[PDB]
Amino acid sequence: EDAELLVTVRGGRLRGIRLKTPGGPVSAFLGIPFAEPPMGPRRFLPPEPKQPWSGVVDATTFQSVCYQYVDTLYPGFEGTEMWNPNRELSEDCLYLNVWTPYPRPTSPTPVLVWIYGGGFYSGASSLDVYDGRFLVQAERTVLVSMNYRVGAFGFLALPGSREAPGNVGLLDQRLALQWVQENVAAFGGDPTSVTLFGESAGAASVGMHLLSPPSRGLFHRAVLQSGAPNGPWATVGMGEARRRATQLAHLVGCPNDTELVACLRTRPAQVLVNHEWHVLPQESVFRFSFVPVVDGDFLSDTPEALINAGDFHGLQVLVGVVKDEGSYFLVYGAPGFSKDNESLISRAEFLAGVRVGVPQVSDLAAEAVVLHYTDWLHPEDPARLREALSDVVGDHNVVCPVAQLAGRLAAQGARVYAYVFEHRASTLSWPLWMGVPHGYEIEFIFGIPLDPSRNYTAEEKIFAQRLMRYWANFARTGDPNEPQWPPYTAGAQQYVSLDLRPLEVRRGLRAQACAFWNRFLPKLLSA
Amino acid sequence: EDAELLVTVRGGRLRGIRLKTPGGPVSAFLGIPFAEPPMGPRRFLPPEPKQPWSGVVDATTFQSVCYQYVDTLYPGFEGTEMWNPNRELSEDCLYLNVWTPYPRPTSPTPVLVWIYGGGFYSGASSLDVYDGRFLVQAERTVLVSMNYRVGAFGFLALPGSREAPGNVGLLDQRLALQWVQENVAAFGGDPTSVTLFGESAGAASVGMHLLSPPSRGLFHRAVLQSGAPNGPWATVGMGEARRRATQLAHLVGCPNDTELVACLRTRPAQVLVNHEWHVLPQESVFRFSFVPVVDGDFLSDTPEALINAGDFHGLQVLVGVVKDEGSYFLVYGAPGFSKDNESLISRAEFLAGVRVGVPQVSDLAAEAVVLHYTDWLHPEDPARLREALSDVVGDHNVVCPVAQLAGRLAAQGARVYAYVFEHRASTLSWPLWMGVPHGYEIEFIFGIPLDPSRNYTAEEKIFAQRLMRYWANFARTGDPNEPQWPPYTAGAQQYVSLDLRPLEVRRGLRAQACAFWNRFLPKLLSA
Ligand SMILES: *[C@@H]1O[C@H](CO[C@@H]2O[C@@H](C)[C@@H](O)[C@@H](O)[C@@H]2O)[C@@H](O[C@@H]2O[C@H](CO)[C@@H](O)[C@H](O)[C@H]2NC(C)=O)[C@H](O)[C@H]1NC(C)=O
Ligand SMILES: *[C@@H]1O[C@H](CO[C@@H]2O[C@@H](C)[C@@H](O)[C@@H](O)[C@@H]2O)[C@@H](O[C@@H]2O[C@H](CO)[C@@H](O)[C@H](O)[C@H]2NC(C)=O)[C@H](O)[C@H]1NC(C)=O
Ligand SMILES: COc1cc2c(cc1OC)C(=O)[C@H](CC1CCN(Cc3ccccc3)CC1)C2
Ligand SMILES: COc1cc2c(cc1OC)C(=O)[C@H](CC1CCN(Cc3ccccc3)CC1)C2
């Protein structure tokens, strides 16, 4: 046997596997249990630490994916399938993965912890696009990724109840981070240099750990890609969480909070998934039924309030967005959109699309959106309308929540670096009109282009290596730099473009659009 | 005696004067009485037709200027003095002026009728800049201009009362127009071709005659320069007119409508003028105490409603603005502004200036203004802030009311031509930062540069001749064209730039800005 692939952690012994990479081997420990399986009476409850085991746990393959909806929108299309579960679904799903250089580092090595996105309703650490093998070999880090509960299993909340307190998926993440603190040294990782990074709901997760004191001691630096805890999709208030939980019970034949959860616990996991989208109150894109709930516990206040009131001295954070954050979402409900035509919508479809992209706001707020995003010299031009609705959804859900987070953190003591990712992958299957869509920077950060079996270009490989170096520099030092990448500040608002050309420094994260969403529109909604 | 200078009109015989002009002689009949002097018991009352006289009235000089405030902001500065009364003040002021070619035309000639601006509180037909001799000689038109009551004497209203019904200044204008119908043929003018033109409050007056049926039979075309009847300064509601009238009475020692007006009729004219500005409810620029009142009589409803509900087929209209409608107004009250420095204001002064320029709106509405007019990449640049406040005032008071009117008229049957006047006069006394300010296209339309005694460049003389041709072409044919000047439409929104260069066609009268003022902001104020 190979001693490099045998590790003893606090709970017992593990057997890993040696993996090939174009640059040399790496060691991988996949499917390490970090919590007791949250099944049966355990459903909806906070995770409990995994009890010690005798013998050797086989950490040689990815474990199951947490129960979740499977996207049926374009069956067999690789653009949607790459995000779907690639292992069987199970509620017995709380496992994490460690990648380390081969042979294992003997001196403490900086740790990256990946939190996957997927709207808090989907995702898995086993997806191909999250393969940590390239980052670990090229940049000599330890990489950890964990599965955490999603959808009703992670975030159904009956606030006040002990049975379904909400946010347990976030506690799954915290438990994995405590696991890293306690065991990552056994794999050569340095528990004193832990950088959290995540995308979309994973980024929103990272931010929530920044704003929750019990988690803030489990890591040192943060990377938020295309997501933020203050996103209008990332949290729900207590009353709407209760209504969504109560409607879900009703749709599956249930029924006292205790009595309601007890009946929910009797239902097959798949039954809850089958009705998940039906508890959304209005037609929408970029909205998800079961998300973190602001209840005073995990989050003592709203993320916006917590951001505006925080001392962030000593924090370095790396944030950014893709060029077209909104386009991807339009084909899941905006009238007139399809990946298979050019989606050259009419003004009437644009107007209807605005209510789908900004659901549950006053007619006055919707008019304000139409005012800002209409070119009144070309009010009915279909191409401009398509781009404008994509900007509405992208600005409102991603860019402007990210800009607000970065502005407040910088103005309150944190060093912030900002990027816009502007390269469209040669391999992208989605239509050209979607531009650079949500999620398609991840494969470059993880160095997937280095995989020879895939058909990336030679400068795409160099680009991936640049990005891995930036990300790993930030993990090691708080500074992505080795043309220079300057910090983002509330005044100068500098960020860099990431593409095949050299770094170009630019100003303003859609500053005009984000003044509307971050400064004016809240005032309108309060009055 | 000279027969060219003798004319008989319905009220009796008139003697005029022969005027010299760089291009040839013109006949002028200045100071023709068209109403009984509205003095004593007649103050605040509708005008009464001039009773016929025996003998010959000498119409040889301008009559007195209607009682009015005199601008004291920069004493002896020609930029302010040129607008101040150049004849003694009197309530005995209801006289009009006719200019005709010498010798008198042999065939019926098109008539231009000028209505001066001055915020409805000031102005006079005698000002040097309204000298009709050049238009008449260059373009062989008949030109008429009238005095009409201003300030409290023209527009103090106690709505419902017979003693101060309001709008008598507009009835002064209407009576003069009836005089033109009955008498202009005696000067060679064609009463079937009468074109109204006016600037600022005169433009708004022209517009109100378009929307008042009794006036509509007295003219055929209209020209609105830098003003519109739907401007937020040009009308007041019944209750606010009553409150201003009542506060004016209170401030001059007056306690029943008839008893109140009777007490006011005893006060010296100058005493009413001395208190005129004190009835404005809030600190402001571009607001005037006594303006046309929406009463159900002269205006069946608000100008905005009448515009939106009217059939305008068969109407030709020429409308336009200067490049910098707002700058002039800032030195009358916006903090940090002066003609004598560069008025490089701070953000704090800008914010304060926005409430002065947009008085009596909700805090939320003010925030919406700040959002649209702040460049959030340069929120504090003094030069940009100065230009932004000027655009706020120019867009809100002039450009966007003119654009709304032009768009509605075109879409409802009228042929519309639109211009932006972009030439800054060589002789201009105001600082360079004001650009092309409110009012400074008038001297070119009237051909004042052809006066040799003045020091205009030769190119300005050519330019004035071009502009007179456009105006007279429109007056004769409804079409300024002889590069072509296309009609303005709600869709294409085409207009021409007027300066020393040839006609350049452009699109949108500040369209992004005016969507905010005309489409969104009203919805906000009602909610
Ligand atoms: C672009 O596609 C949308 C969606 O239609 C789907 O994709 C097309 C490629 C084609 O295969 C359609 O039949 C598919 O349904 C079109 O909008 C749809 O129009 C139909 C009827 O005309 C309607 O029943 C759907 O609800 C519409 N989908 C909406 C509103 O989201 C759209 O018209 C296409 N654009 C074109 C053809 O120019
Ligand atoms: C630009 O001028 C304004 C107006 O001030 C007047 O004109 C100046 C040329 C100078 O002679 C001033 O003293 C005049 O009062 C300045 O704003 C004024 O500032 C003073 C304080 O110094 C204050 O008492 C006034 O109320 C201000 N007036 C207004 C209308 O706000 C302004 O500071 C000057 N800007 C410069 C010099 O950059
Ligand atoms: C089935 O019903 C619905 C399903 C969805 C929506 C609305 C729905 O109806 C309201 C959405 O808005 C979602 C659209 C996202 C699906 C996942 N992808 C790929 C991706 C996954 C993870 C990270 C980054 C990208 C992005 C768009 C799904
Ligand atoms: C004394 O108080 C005030 C006086 C004025 C304002 C506010 C005031 O206090 C709030 C204004 O806003 C007015 C500013 C105009 C004065 C006349 N001119 C010249 C002109 C005359 C006729 C047509 C076109 C231009 C333009 C600016 C006057």
XYZ file of C-alpha atoms in Angstrom, chain A:
527
model
C 0.000 0.000 0.000
C 0.970 3.639 -0.597
C 1.521 5.532 2.659
C 0.816 8.861 0.913
C -2.830 7.787 0.451
C -3.331 6.713 4.078
C -4.401 9.465 6.472
C -5.750 9.386 10.005
C -8.238 12.114 10.929
C -9.944 12.595 14.268
C -12.715 10.191 13.370
C -10.551 7.344 12.099
C -8.505 6.191 9.132
C -8.947 7.031 5.451
C -7.723 5.530 2.187
C -7.352 7.977 -0.695
C -6.451 7.730 -4.372
C -3.677 9.006 -6.656
C -4.877 11.109 -9.596
C -3.180 11.997 -12.872
C -2.864 15.612 -14.091
C -0.937 17.021 -17.078
C 1.566 18.444 -14.551
C 2.047 15.422 -12.264
C 0.118 13.369 -9.694
C -2.036 14.718 -6.865
C -3.533 12.920 -3.869
C -7.308 12.998 -3.470
C -9.489 12.020 -0.523
C -13.048 11.938 -1.822
C -16.234 11.244 0.100
C -14.958 11.788 3.658
C -17.978 11.737 6.027
C -18.102 14.876 8.170
C -21.618 14.644 9.639
C -24.011 11.969 10.738
C -26.411 11.207 7.849
C -29.324 13.621 8.338
C -32.047 11.047 7.564
C -35.421 10.204 9.052
C -35.897 12.083 12.343
C -32.771 14.007 11.389
C -34.291 15.669 8.314
C -34.330 19.495 8.604
C -32.201 19.372 11.767
C -28.750 20.914 12.256
C -25.942 18.522 11.332
C -24.313 16.415 13.997
C -20.596 15.604 13.933
C -19.715 12.278 12.365
C -19.143 9.641 15.041
C -15.705 7.976 15.020
C -15.392 4.760 13.030
C -13.164 1.723 13.251
C -11.422 0.381 10.235
C -10.550 2.364 7.135
C -13.067 4.515 5.294
C -12.581 4.261 1.537
C -12.072 7.850 0.364
C -11.559 6.886 -3.239
C -14.718 8.027 -5.044
C -17.256 10.850 -4.890
C -20.178 10.226 -2.565
C -23.846 10.866 -3.347
C -25.362 14.223 -4.266
C -27.790 15.811 -1.813
C -31.427 15.482 -2.927
C -32.306 18.256 -5.389
C -34.285 19.203 -8.498
C -32.776 18.082 -11.818
C -32.991 20.642 -14.621
C -35.235 19.296 -17.414
C -35.138 22.390 -19.625
C -33.017 21.154 -22.568
C -32.736 17.375 -22.086
C -29.339 16.111 -23.214
C -27.941 19.594 -23.882
C -24.473 19.814 -22.334
C -25.103 23.443 -21.338
C -27.679 22.337 -18.783
C -26.434 18.795 -18.031
C -22.981 19.883 -16.821
C -24.723 21.316 -13.719
C -26.980 18.332 -13.022
C -26.194 15.621 -10.448
C -23.552 13.172 -11.695
C -23.959 10.740 -8.771
C -27.127 9.279 -7.327
C -29.292 11.436 -5.095
C -29.451 10.689 -1.367
C -30.119 12.526 1.873
C -27.011 10.675 3.141
C -24.875 13.184 1.383
C -22.744 15.162 3.900
C -19.261 14.273 2.635
C -16.290 16.453 1.757
C -13.245 16.106 -0.476
C -9.558 16.942 0.013
C -6.965 17.345 -2.752
C -3.276 17.733 -1.872
C -0.019 17.652 -3.834
C 1.740 14.308 -4.366
C 3.539 13.428 -2.269
C 1.632 15.106 0.562
C 3.125 18.426 1.703
C 5.226 18.166 4.822
C 5.159 21.859 5.546
C 1.862 23.700 6.166
C 0.216 24.475 2.822
C -2.471 27.155 2.226
C -6.032 25.834 2.014
C -8.791 26.740 -0.461
C -12.330 25.748 0.515
C -14.828 25.658 -2.348
C -18.566 26.173 -1.738
C -20.572 25.362 -4.858
C -23.484 27.465 -6.069
C -26.791 26.478 -7.568
C -29.379 28.834 -6.057
C -29.333 26.935 -2.712
C -31.541 24.314 -4.462
C -28.884 22.356 -6.418
C -25.160 21.695 -6.803
C -22.638 19.066 -5.830
C -18.944 18.892 -5.064
C -18.532 16.031 -7.593
C -19.282 18.066 -10.731
C -16.525 17.941 -13.336
C -16.194 21.714 -13.418
C -15.178 21.710 -9.704
C -12.309 19.191 -10.064
C -9.617 20.469 -7.692
C -6.774 18.394 -9.202
C -5.365 21.162 -11.434
C -5.346 23.976 -8.848
C -3.601 21.748 -6.366
C -0.848 20.637 -8.756
C -0.211 23.995 -10.449
C -0.373 26.166 -7.342
C 0.526 23.735 -4.532
C -2.466 24.359 -2.294
C -4.706 22.053 -0.349
C -8.235 22.225 -1.773
C -11.348 21.191 0.153
C -14.909 21.038 -1.133
C -17.987 19.872 0.748
C -21.519 18.838 -0.034
C -24.213 20.729 1.851
C -27.971 20.250 1.913
C -30.052 22.245 -0.598
C -33.711 23.007 -1.249
C -36.165 22.079 1.461
C -33.603 19.757 3.113
C -31.184 22.616 3.565
C -33.373 25.687 4.082
C -37.013 24.898 4.820
C -37.755 27.066 7.851
C -40.594 27.275 10.350
C -39.041 30.146 12.326
C -39.017 29.695 16.076
C -39.536 25.920 15.807
C -36.889 23.504 17.037
C -37.942 20.959 14.413
C -37.260 23.080 11.321
C -35.103 26.028 12.457
C -33.828 26.874 8.968
C -30.318 27.475 7.617
C -29.116 23.915 8.277
C -27.373 23.834 4.875
C -25.327 26.787 6.110
C -24.560 24.843 9.297
C -23.468 21.917 7.079
C -20.910 24.325 5.600
C -19.846 25.591 9.038
C -19.401 22.023 10.262
C -17.177 21.252 7.247
C -15.123 24.366 8.035
C -14.762 23.188 11.640
C -13.691 19.830 10.182
C -11.006 21.628 8.166
C -9.758 23.402 11.300
C -9.456 20.070 13.113
C -8.139 17.722 10.394
C -6.659 19.598 7.447
C -3.185 19.496 9.041
C -3.270 15.717 8.615
C -3.181 16.352 4.857
C -0.464 19.002 4.960
C -2.851 21.940 5.042
C -2.396 24.997 7.237
C -5.558 25.658 9.300
C -4.254 29.221 9.884
C -4.474 30.074 6.129
C -7.980 29.138 4.931
C -9.486 31.021 1.970
C -13.189 30.530 1.262
C -14.275 30.783 -2.359
C -17.592 30.140 -4.028
C -19.794 31.114 -6.932
C -23.439 32.293 -7.099
C -25.173 30.713 -4.065
C -21.688 29.595 -2.969
C -20.469 33.196 -3.054
C -23.608 34.210 -1.158
C -22.699 31.487 1.332
C -19.144 32.823 1.706
C -20.566 36.258 2.449
C -22.959 34.858 5.026
C -20.038 33.213 6.818
C -18.311 36.629 6.778
C -21.309 38.116 8.614
C -21.819 35.306 11.156
C -19.348 35.498 14.094
C -19.304 31.723 14.823
C -18.099 31.101 11.226
C -15.808 34.129 10.989
C -13.184 32.395 13.096
C -12.932 29.403 10.720
C -11.262 31.158 7.764
C -9.078 34.130 6.917
C -9.805 35.363 3.367
C -12.827 35.298 1.073
C -13.587 35.113 -2.666
C -17.099 35.890 -3.908
C -17.681 35.032 -7.592
C -20.963 36.271 -9.156
C -22.878 36.342 -5.894
C -23.360 38.161 -2.629
C -25.321 37.612 0.605
C -27.312 40.814 -0.050
C -28.645 39.475 -3.339
C -32.460 39.761 -3.528
C -32.577 35.960 -4.069
C -30.150 34.909 -1.322
C -32.301 35.408 1.801
C -35.992 35.399 2.739
C -37.764 36.953 5.674
C -39.301 34.873 8.431
C -42.941 35.296 7.391
C -42.368 34.323 3.755
C -40.219 31.351 4.781
C -43.093 30.164 7.013
C -45.587 30.645 4.228
C -43.390 28.701 1.771
C -42.820 25.875 4.250
C -46.567 25.792 5.010
C -47.525 25.718 1.329
C -45.058 22.903 0.622
C -46.592 20.798 3.404
C -50.048 21.431 1.919
C -49.010 20.364 -1.598
C -47.710 17.016 -0.302
C -50.647 16.188 1.986
C -49.545 17.562 5.408
C -51.025 17.908 8.059
C -48.722 22.688 15.508
C -45.267 23.151 13.986
C -44.187 19.798 15.451
C -47.074 17.999 13.729
C -46.365 19.666 10.392
C -42.657 18.798 10.274
C -43.369 15.267 11.503
C -45.667 14.698 8.528
C -43.059 16.229 6.196
C -40.457 13.813 7.561
C -42.608 10.885 6.381
C -42.532 11.948 2.725
C -39.956 10.542 0.273
C -37.304 13.156 -0.470
C -38.277 13.150 -4.153
C -41.832 14.175 -3.262
C -40.636 17.409 -1.663
C -38.453 18.149 -4.694
C -41.405 17.562 -7.033
C -43.355 20.508 -5.582
C -40.440 22.798 -4.682
C -40.913 25.402 -7.403
C -44.668 25.665 -6.776
C -44.264 27.579 -3.474
C -42.798 30.600 -5.262
C -45.479 33.328 -4.981
C -45.156 34.811 -8.499
C -43.760 34.005 -11.922
C -40.046 34.723 -11.823
C -36.538 33.904 -12.891
C -33.548 33.950 -10.528
C -35.704 33.114 -7.486
C -35.473 30.023 -5.327
C -37.938 28.575 -2.865
C -35.736 27.607 0.089
C -32.866 29.972 0.873
C -31.208 31.258 4.084
C -33.730 32.911 6.410
C -33.025 36.069 8.423
C -34.183 35.002 11.886
C -31.710 36.596 14.339
C -29.695 33.395 14.788
C -27.219 32.591 11.972
C -27.794 36.149 10.693
C -28.624 38.583 13.504
C -29.953 41.011 10.875
C -30.288 41.324 7.119
C -27.015 40.974 5.203
C -27.459 44.556 3.947
C -27.742 45.835 7.522
C -24.833 43.664 8.666
C -22.667 44.892 5.788
C -23.383 48.594 6.359
C -22.640 48.314 10.103
C -19.490 46.153 10.112
C -15.828 46.758 10.920
C -13.932 44.928 8.163
C -10.371 45.913 9.008
C -8.088 42.939 8.528
C -10.253 41.481 5.757
C -9.097 40.934 2.213
C -11.744 39.868 -0.250
C -11.734 39.084 -3.979
C -15.003 39.590 -5.816
C -16.164 39.754 -9.383
C -18.740 38.995 -12.031
C -18.993 37.703 -15.583
C -19.716 40.048 -18.493
C -23.378 38.966 -18.940
C -24.690 37.890 -15.531
C -28.334 37.967 -16.604
C -28.555 36.316 -20.027
C -28.574 32.676 -18.835
C -31.684 33.229 -16.722
C -33.931 34.632 -19.465
C -34.549 31.213 -21.059
C -36.156 29.955 -17.825
C -39.269 32.156 -18.011
C -38.849 35.490 -19.784
C -41.384 35.575 -22.657
C -39.898 35.259 -26.107
C -36.561 33.760 -25.044
C -34.947 30.580 -26.323
C -31.404 29.307 -26.598
C -32.309 28.138 -30.130
C -33.288 31.436 -31.745
C -31.861 34.920 -31.344
C -34.555 35.938 -28.813
C -35.172 39.270 -30.557
C -38.082 40.214 -28.305
C -40.713 42.899 -28.760
C -41.363 45.827 -26.462
C -44.418 44.050 -25.044
C -42.258 41.009 -24.234
C -39.596 43.252 -22.705
C -42.212 44.912 -20.485
C -43.647 41.539 -19.478
C -40.095 40.260 -18.922
C -39.376 43.076 -16.467
C -42.072 41.815 -14.079
C -40.653 38.292 -14.335
C -37.116 39.484 -13.634
C -38.074 41.877 -10.812
C -40.988 39.992 -9.203
C -43.232 41.227 -6.397
C -42.508 44.945 -6.651
C -44.940 47.829 -7.012
C -46.040 48.896 -10.470
C -44.219 52.166 -9.731
C -40.934 50.326 -9.068
C -41.402 48.370 -12.298
C -41.976 51.624 -14.219
C -38.771 52.981 -12.702
C -36.899 49.949 -14.059
C -38.371 50.412 -17.544
C -37.379 54.104 -17.466
C -33.762 53.327 -16.593
C -33.291 50.476 -19.077
C -35.097 51.931 -22.092
C -33.135 53.762 -24.759
C -35.785 56.360 -25.529
C -34.307 56.999 -28.976
C -34.754 53.254 -29.782
C -37.579 52.175 -27.463
C -38.651 49.136 -29.511
C -35.428 47.833 -31.084
C -35.457 44.044 -30.382
C -31.683 43.562 -30.025
C -31.396 46.468 -27.584
C -34.416 45.100 -25.702
C -32.827 41.652 -25.375
C -29.582 43.153 -24.044
C -31.532 45.468 -21.750
C -33.626 42.758 -20.089
C -30.441 40.721 -19.599
C -28.881 43.769 -17.926
C -31.949 44.184 -15.713
C -31.671 40.628 -14.437
C -27.878 40.748 -14.187
C -27.688 44.148 -12.487
C -30.477 43.466 -10.023
C -29.422 39.957 -9.033
C -25.605 39.971 -9.236
C -23.602 43.020 -10.332
C -25.194 45.576 -8.073
C -25.386 43.397 -4.931
C -21.693 42.620 -5.544
C -20.847 46.296 -6.083
C -22.624 47.330 -2.902
C -20.812 44.636 -0.919
C -17.427 45.644 -2.365
C -18.090 49.363 -1.806
C -19.130 48.976 1.823
C -16.338 46.540 2.683
C -13.675 48.770 1.125
C -15.034 51.878 2.859
C -15.069 50.002 6.196
C -11.559 48.608 6.417
C -11.298 45.729 3.957
C -8.934 45.463 1.018
C -11.082 44.526 -1.978
C -10.097 43.345 -5.442
C -12.664 43.329 -8.237
C -12.844 41.757 -11.675
C -15.139 41.405 -14.651
C -14.609 38.119 -16.472
C -14.936 38.790 -20.194
C -13.773 35.650 -21.999
C -16.318 33.442 -23.774
C -15.059 29.874 -23.723
C -14.290 28.417 -27.150
C -16.183 25.336 -25.900
C -19.390 27.147 -24.915
C -22.557 25.448 -26.179
C -24.951 28.303 -25.293
C -25.830 30.763 -28.102
C -23.621 33.710 -28.898
C -26.303 36.181 -27.801
C -25.896 35.036 -24.187
C -22.349 36.437 -24.208
C -20.321 35.308 -21.190
C -23.029 33.729 -19.007
C -23.340 33.147 -15.274
C -21.084 30.320 -14.131
C -18.730 30.072 -17.090
C -15.684 31.556 -15.383
C -15.525 28.600 -12.954
C -13.930 26.118 -15.381
C -11.070 28.587 -15.919
C -10.489 29.244 -12.195
C -10.219 25.475 -11.653
C -7.889 25.035 -14.619
C -10.241 22.659 -16.497
C -8.731 23.857 -19.846
C -5.557 21.973 -18.891
C -7.442 18.672 -19.233
C -6.107 17.208 -22.509
C -9.283 15.189 -23.180
C -11.103 18.541 -23.578
C -10.826 20.822 -26.587
C -9.643 24.196 -25.302
C -7.197 26.357 -27.235
C -3.595 26.947 -26.352
C -4.105 30.476 -25.168
C -7.148 29.337 -23.167
C -4.736 27.047 -21.283
C -2.381 29.974 -20.600
C -5.392 32.074 -19.515
C -6.470 29.383 -17.060
C -2.937 29.310 -15.631
C -3.024 33.092 -15.162
C -6.317 32.815 -13.292
C -5.140 29.991 -11.040
C -2.049 32.075 -10.232
C -4.200 35.145 -9.400
C -6.546 33.133 -7.178
C -3.725 31.280 -5.417
C -1.701 34.467 -4.915
C -4.738 35.910 -3.155
C -5.126 32.817 -0.991
C -1.431 32.964 0.010
C -1.109 36.748 0.565
C -4.417 38.592 0.287
C -3.143 40.126 -2.937
C -3.649 38.556 -6.392
C -0.683 40.433 -7.896
C 2.625 38.769 -8.798
C 0.377 45.559 -15.412
C -0.941 45.764 -11.839
C -4.317 44.896 -10.308
C -5.273 47.782 -7.963
C -7.628 47.564 -4.987
C -11.282 48.496 -5.501
C -12.401 51.560 -3.525
C -15.777 53.298 -3.156
C -14.458 56.412 -4.884
C -12.192 55.229 -7.700
C -14.172 51.954 -8.132
C -11.321 50.310 -10.049
C -11.585 46.712 -11.264
C -9.814 44.655 -13.935
C -11.085 42.817 -16.986
C -10.075 39.154 -17.148
C -9.683 37.808 -20.700
C -6.973 36.678 -23.152
C -5.522 40.195 -23.358
C -3.428 41.638 -20.521
C -5.079 43.152 -17.466
C -6.933 46.355 -18.242
C -7.944 48.570 -15.337
C -11.417 50.118 -15.645
C -13.761 52.122 -13.421
C -17.211 51.447 -12.029
C -19.079 48.171 -11.675
C -21.997 49.380 -13.776
C -22.031 52.455 -11.573
C -24.984 54.184 -13.244
C -27.209 51.083 -13.073
C -26.139 50.255 -9.537
C -26.905 53.735 -8.200
C -30.511 53.013 -9.170
C -30.679 49.562 -7.554
C -28.589 50.338 -4.487
C -29.375 54.001 -3.735
C -32.750 54.977 -5.203
C -34.966 51.897 -5.600
C -34.871 50.977 -1.872
C -36.043 54.519 -1.045
C -38.927 54.141 -3.496
C -39.989 50.807 -1.985
C -40.064 52.254 1.566
C -42.422 55.062 0.486
